């Protein structure tokens, strides 16, 4: 008779999903263009030339500052104005609810027709690949496990074992 999901954070779940998948975009094209390595060949020296390295972790803090600000500020406003208290529109806070967030303050607003919209015209471009990208990524990320695991050599770890016949990798192809 069937569960009811519908779940209601939800519409958010789908926009969370865009983040994951559009981001998932960076990976594929670039690594793979991969230089079709490559003509040949790739050297880093340059910065990191001998400066005791470059990033390690410190690289991760900068990565995050730059981001924190962005991921953070953010959803903080994809949207959301009204912003208080007592009783429900349900979004889940819903505060923006009736008031958009502002009657009369500014142009919070973008564009014609007392609205947020860029407007009617297009699902087009980007519902099919961008969501098709919801799909794409998952299988191609599912492809990443396939691509390393089995670690040819270095590490069995803890064997009840019982492979080899032969190694695993990516270069590409498949044998067979």
């Amino acid at each position: 008779s069937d569960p009811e999901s519908l779940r209601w954070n939800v519409q958010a779940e789908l926009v969370h999903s865009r983040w994951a998948m559009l981001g998932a975009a960076g990976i594929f094209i670039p690594e793979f263009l991969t230089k079709l390595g490559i003509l040949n060949t790739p050297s880093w020296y340059t910065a990191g030339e001998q400066e005791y390295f470059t990033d390690t972790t410190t690289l991760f803090i900068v990565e995050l500052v730059f981001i924190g600000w962005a991921e953070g500020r953010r959803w903080a406003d994809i949207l959301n104005p009204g912003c208080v208290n007592t009783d429900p529109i349900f979004p889940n806070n819903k505060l923006t609810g009736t008031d958009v967030g502002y009657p009369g303050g500014l142009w919070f607003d973008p564009l014609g027709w007392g609205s947020a919209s860029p407007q009617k015209l297009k699902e087009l471009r980007t519902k099919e690949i961008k969501n098709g990208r919801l799909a794409m990524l998952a299988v191609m990320g599912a492809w990443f496990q396939h691509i390393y695991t089995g670690t040819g050599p270095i590490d069995n770890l803890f064997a009840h074992l019982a492979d080899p016949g032969h190694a695993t990798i990516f270069a590409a192809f498949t044998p067979k």
Binding site: T41, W44, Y45
Partner: protein, 85 residues
């Protein structure tokens, strides 16, 4: 990591090698790549010589095919007059 010359001087190589006589497998069953065996024309126990034997014969084995069902023999029990012994 860090790099000194050239990812390799001479790239990637023998890790799949096989190339000419990219063999193993087809062949091996090189006896097989071909089967050519026995005789042409007939009488009897090919089965070589190598390979071997006539063992049980005409229908048996061969099977394999043998070939061609003769006017036989005709395996069915009964004959063989069961020659043990």
């Amino acid at each position: 990591g860090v790099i000194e010359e050239y990812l390799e001087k001479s790239k990637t190589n023998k890790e799949l090698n096989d190339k000419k006589r990219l063999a193993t497998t087809g062949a091996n069953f090189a006896r097989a790549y071909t089967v050519e065996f026995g005789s042409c024309k007939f009488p009897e126990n090919f089965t070589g010589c190598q390979d071997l034997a006539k063992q049980k014969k005409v229908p048996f084995l061969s099977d394999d095919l043998d070939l061609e069902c003769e006017g036989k023999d005709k395996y069915k029990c009964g004959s063989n007059v069961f020659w043990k012994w």
